[PDB]
Amino acid sequence: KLWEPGFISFEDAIKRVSKIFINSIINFNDLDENNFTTVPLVIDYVTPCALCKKRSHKHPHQLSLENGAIRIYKTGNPHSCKVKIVPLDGNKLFNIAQRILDTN
Amino acid sequence: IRGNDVIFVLKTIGVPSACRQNEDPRFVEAFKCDELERYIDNNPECTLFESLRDEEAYSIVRIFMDVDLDACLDEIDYLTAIQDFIIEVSNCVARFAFTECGAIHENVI
Numbered sequence: 001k002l003w004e005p006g007f008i009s010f011e012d013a014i015k016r017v018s019k020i021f022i023n024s025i026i027n028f029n030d031l032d033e034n035n036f037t038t039v040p041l042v043i044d045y046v047t048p049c050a051l052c053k054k055r056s057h058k059h060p061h062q063l064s065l066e067n068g069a070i071r072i073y074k075t076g077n078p079h080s081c082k083v084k085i086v087p088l089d090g091n092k093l094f095n096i097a098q099r100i101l102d103t104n
Numbered sequence: 105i106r107g108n109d110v111i112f113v114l115k116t117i118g119v120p121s122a123c124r125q126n127e128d129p130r131f132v133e134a135f136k137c138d139e140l141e142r143y144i145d146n147n148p149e150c151t152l153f154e155s156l157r158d159e160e161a162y163s164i165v166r167i168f169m170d171v172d173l174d175a176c177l178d179e180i181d182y183l184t185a186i187q188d189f190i191i192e193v194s195n196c197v198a199r200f201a202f203t204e205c206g207a208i209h210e211n212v213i
């Protein structure tokens with residue numbers, strides 16, 4: 001089990017990460033709780049990449065789990081793409097409210 | 105392509121393609137409309153996933169929207185939201201068809 005289902009249903013997290021990727025995901029079906037940190041995410045770059053804004057990517061992206069979040073990073077040349085983060089805990093409005101109180 | 109009375113279906117999630125084009129009865133099936141209905145009534149526990157045979161020749165399908173929101177709302181909000189949503193989806197599809205597809209916005213709307 002590479003996924004800890006203590007944050008969000010794995011299907012919902014995959015739905016979020018797919019929504020981030022405007023381009024169609026090729027192997028969306030095989031992402032499960034025991035492979036999502038291993039298999040590269042091959043993407044059909046019909047549209048420009050949603051992260052690097054280029055025409056396409058030479059190498060597929062990859063997912064990592066860290067600090068209760070998903071880190072999306074490109075293989076091969078790291079600086080050629082932007083690192084992306086998907087959170088899993090907290091209503092975003094609650095984070096905003098915490099920041100606003102935080103200012104005093 | 106003008107009409108197709110038979111529907112391609114999957115039996116479960118995770119079907120490999122090599123079974124999909126080979127038409128493996130253990131994963132995929134073809135159902136005639138009346139026979140599809142008969143199978144559905146006769147199998148209340150059936151797991152069926154509608155799909156297509158070949159996108160190269162039969163990419164034309166009806167327009168369908170899916171909305172799955174984890175929030176239970178009353179009937180009034182339900183109806184006002186569904187009418188509004190169909191309004192904006194009609195506006196968007198008409199705008200795109202007029203921009204690129206060259207279709208008449210009123211016709212599609």
Ligand SMILES: [Zn+2]
Pocket residue numbers: 049051052053054056057074080081082
């Ligand atoms: Zn990129």
